[PDB]
Amino acid sequence: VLLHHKTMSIVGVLQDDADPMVSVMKMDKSPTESYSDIGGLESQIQEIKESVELPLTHPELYEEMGIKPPKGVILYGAPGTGKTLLAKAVANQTSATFLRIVGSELIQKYLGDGPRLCRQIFKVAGENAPSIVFIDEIDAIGTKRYDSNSGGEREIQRTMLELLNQLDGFDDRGDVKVIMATNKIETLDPALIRPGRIDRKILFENPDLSTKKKILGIHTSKMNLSEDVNLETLVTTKDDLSGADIQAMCTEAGLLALRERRMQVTAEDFKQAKERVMKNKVEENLEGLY
Amino acid sequence: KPTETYSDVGGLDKQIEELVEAIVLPMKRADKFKDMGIRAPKGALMYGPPGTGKTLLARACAAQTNATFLKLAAPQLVQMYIGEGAK
Amino acid sequence: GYDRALSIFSPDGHIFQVEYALEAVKRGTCAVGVKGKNCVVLGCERRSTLKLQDTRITPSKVSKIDSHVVLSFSGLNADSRILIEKARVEAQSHRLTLEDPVTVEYLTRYVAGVQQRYTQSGGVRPFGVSTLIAGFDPRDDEPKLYQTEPSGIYSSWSAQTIGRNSKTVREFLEKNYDRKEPPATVEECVKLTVRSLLEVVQTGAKNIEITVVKPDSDIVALSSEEINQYVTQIEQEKQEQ
Amino acid sequence: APSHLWDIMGDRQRLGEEHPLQVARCTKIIKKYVINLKQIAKFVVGLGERVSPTDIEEGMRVGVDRSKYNIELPLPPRIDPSVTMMTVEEKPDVTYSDVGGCKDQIEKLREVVELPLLSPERFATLGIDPPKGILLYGPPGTGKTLCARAVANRTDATFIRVIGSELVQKYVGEGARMVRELFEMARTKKACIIFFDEIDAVGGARFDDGAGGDNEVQRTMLELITQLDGFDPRGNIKVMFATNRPNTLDPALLRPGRIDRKVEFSLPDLEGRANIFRIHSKSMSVERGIRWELISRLCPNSTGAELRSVCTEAGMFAIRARRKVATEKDFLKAVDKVISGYKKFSSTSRYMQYN
Amino acid sequence: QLLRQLASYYSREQDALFITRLAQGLLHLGKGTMTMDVFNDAHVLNKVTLASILTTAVGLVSPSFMLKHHQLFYMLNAGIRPKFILALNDEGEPIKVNVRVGQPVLLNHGERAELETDEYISYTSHIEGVVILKKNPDYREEE
């Protein structure tokens, strides 16, 4: 507010300008990442579009139907399936507020500040626009190995149950969407999900030889390739690879041609790129059966 | 003075006579205690099962005796300001 | 030894050691098979990630329990060797005790009955593998195809698949294949299994193993060149139609 | 426009010195008043012109003039906490008729809460004591928080929703003050409702020999129990304890005398789950001639969270499955989807009843 | 939030119960799926709607403004223009088209749509309203 010097009387209220306090809120300047780059996943792309983008873009479908729209979707799958870029392309066409939070920031060093942070995340986001709370790669409270910020077993129950009350005790008109994704959701407390709020569950698997042909053409669209490079030949050599491993070979092939400063990448760069990815970047999983 | 007295309990006379010899009789018979040469007890531990407990009789001690009572809560003695809880 | 129980009823009424064991089958190689009037065909795939595997020295994915009946499973390979060995010993034990060749009906209820013991036996865990028993009874030409689930429930099926991408193949076998008019020739039974493997194997050759079961204790295993012969004829009638 | 009318009366309320008062809490009353300022300064004062002698009480904020200290106007105490001002909600959206089923989890709550508030003279004839506290835990996913909001609608009074993690602050000992903040409004605002959510993070003895940082949380209940039932039985309103883990709580908290009515939620049966789809049948789109008793029968025993997911997902099949409204065929597809498809892992229902 | 703040006027006026709920029912007129607009795709100004809302603005009820009667606000029922789309063939047999709107998805004769055109060929303009769908012998897609 605004006081007075002599009379010490309130002159009026002073609103906070230049953004709502904390500016790390990920206001999304909208680099405009389209759906053409995530193409090939369209089987699972239209799944999240109907439960997230559809009620925001076309609210008349759910309002006239009478059903309540879901508050989000949980994602599970092996790393490299494009779970990070799936939610990024959705917020582009909606042109609304969207948040990106790292799961490791839910717990702090001071005791009691963990649940205090989770209160301010949904409070500020819910005041301005039909925002969306997206927390990616949640390792929170498992395999601790933390000397500094470890709060014992008391921080476990306060921080997690604070997020559950935001989807239960916190009232909302349906404009707040919560989407959680990570590598393994089994280590997390299943009571935190409460799948009466989230009716959508999307899984992910490794693409086949037909899908990798579309993904390879995406990264090579802006890349200059020579005439001796075949797209179907590189896909055939791909064995047990995800969407991130395909871009890894396209990036490694670009670095080899960058050292020699070649506009069109020759076929010799793809031969040395696939050998380095399958060696270091691609490690044999602990599954091991068959 | 509270509204709770010793007439609201029963069958507890075994443990009632022991509480009278702690915070009750020295409020009166202390003059007789100095003749025997003993000293009045400076306190008695009050506990029980994980439940309500004897607090119902704690009001009767501050009622029938009609003496000065001071209620001090242990969990109210811990504060963020150092030294204020000690004062 | 170990006397502590494992399988425990969930508060929903199910069992954790059962449902969690069924996920091992869905993560394994898909095993699909069909049966005709005069013949029975059991297809099986292999792991396409691993290479440099000689077919001759590698044990066949379809285990032969008896001359007239074989077993093609899908699931944990560690729990499958226990069922294969104990089913073959009982096959000879049945010939010793009753002096009768075993039947496909008795072999399925035995393997499924043994699985019911480990679920009910404290100190052991259920099998994480599902076996498919198909063969012909002695002096009988009627096809017998029985499914054995890790939970112990067994049933007969005209066309059934287990393993990964099972629901995709099951929906394909209902519309394309009809149980009222099964094919009476062996060539049509082999081409039917190949059509179900096109959506799983996904353009592969050495990873496909098809076992043909015929009456009178006749078993002919299709080689690598014989399997690819039926694949070429189907691909020509697929994209063109 | 409103600023013009306030500038006329602003001559006496600005130029003259009245409002510039220094507010401080009074300590000793001699009938000389010893009052300590916010700057830690002690002084002596007395009554004013219009000040009544009975208005000044021990431990109350009393504004005094900064130049010549004198009592002018009294103020309500406990002005420091700003947290409990936002804990009171108004007009919850969930109504009393939103809770489905004819079972005993409804009538038992209204008799120990809504009955003494609406008709306090009913139990006065028998001369009994209405239950101060209640007990609602149940399995996760039954909508227990929805039943707490249904009571606040019929009550038409102040409702207070307290989060279990809110009681624990960033300082040691501040959580003890957070307890009295809730009970102070009980005497100030009569006939209100307080509700605790997720008390498992607070309650329990947990003893000593553990990690050692656990002694701060166990003192919150000892402050909460003292403020509930202390040496002086001070209480008016109803207290509601709720969490998802009744087994991990304090075995003293699990015994009566702070609580009388104890109701645990259960999974609705075939007759119970039928009413779950009947309250949702008035919403969405229901085809004429469809029997909802067969859908709840094919669905196994599950919490109400997964029961409402059937009606919600049924509308999703109107797009990909090429359907106008929700038909019986889409209901059967939801059985293998909403239920059988979503079981997998990370499905609670009755999975976690304990830890 | 706006319609719930009028509860303070029931004490000052005994007729406020009907006045506050009169315009609320007019908002829900037509089961919420109908409205009143003087514009369309052809830009045709309709004087019937202008002869209803403008006349019922002043003197809505009897106590409003001067002394009036209760028959003045019934003129709004004549300006109802519901939105609909119909597709026939010859004798009126329905034909399924592809339209995604609010209730629905892939509608046909007997439902409504708002600002959408299907992929099926009717005759020429392929617009809303009542149209007749005819297909060529080369590519023919029908119900």
What does this entry show, briefly?
The structure is cut from a larger assembly and holds chains A (290 residues), B (87 residues), C (241 residues), D (355 residues) and E (143 residues). By secondary structure, chain A is α/β, with parallel strands linked by helices.
From the structure above, extract its key features:
part of a larger assembly; 5 chains; C: 241 residues; alpha+beta; Glutamine Phosphoribosylpyrophosphate, subunit 1, domain 1; 5-stranded antiparallel beta sheet; E: little secondary structure; two-stranded parallel ribbon; elongated
Order of helix and strand elements from N to C terminus of chain C: HEEEEHHEEEEHHEEH
Q: Cα distance, first to last residue of chain C?
A: 62 Å
Helix count from the secondary structure assignment of chain D: 11
Helix-and-strand structural type of chain C: alpha+beta
Strand order of the largest sheet of chain C: 8-1-2-9-10
Apparent shape of chain C: globular
- Head-to-tail CA distance between termini of chain D: 62 Å
**Global outline of chain D:** elongated
Q: What is the multimeric organization of the chains shown?
A: part of a larger assembly
List the strand order in the largest sheet of chain D.
6-8-9-10-7-11
In percent, how much strand structure appears in the residues of chain D?
5-15%
Binding site for ATP (chain B): 48-55
Subcellular location (chain B): Cytoplasm; Nucleus
Family (chain B): Belongs to the AAA ATPase family.
Organism (chain B): Saccharomyces cerevisiae (strain ATCC 204508 / S288c)
Helices and strands, with pairings:
The structure is cut from a larger assembly and holds chains A (290 residues), B (87 residues), C (241 residues), D (355 residues) and E (143 residues).
Chain A (H helix, E strand, L loop, with lengths): L41 H16 L2 H6 L7 E4 L6 H12 L4 E4 L10 H15 L4 E5 L17 H13 L10 E5 L18 E4 L5 H11 L11 H7 L5 H18 L6 H15 L9
Parallel strand pairs in A: 1-4, 1-5, 2-3, 3-4
Helix pairs in contact in A: 1-3, 4-5, 6-7, 6-8, 8-9
Chain B lengths: L12 H12 L5 H7 L18 H10 L23
Chain C lengths: L15 H11 L4 E5 L4 E6 L16 E5 L2 E7 L1 H21 L6 H17 L8 E8 L6 E6 L5 E3 L2 E4 L3 H11 L9 H12 L10 E7 L3 E4 L2 H16 L2
Antiparallel strand pairs in C: 1-2, 1-8, 2-9, 3-4, 4-5, 5-6, 6-7, 9-10
Keywords (chain C): Cytoplasm, Nucleus, Phosphoprotein, Proteasome
InterPro entries (chain C): Ntn_hydrolases_N (IPR029055), Proteasome_alpha (IPR050115), Proteasome_alpha-type (IPR023332), Proteasome_asu_N (IPR000426), Proteasome_bsu_CS (IPR016050), Proteasome_sua/b (IPR001353)
Family (chain C): Belongs to the peptidase T1A family.
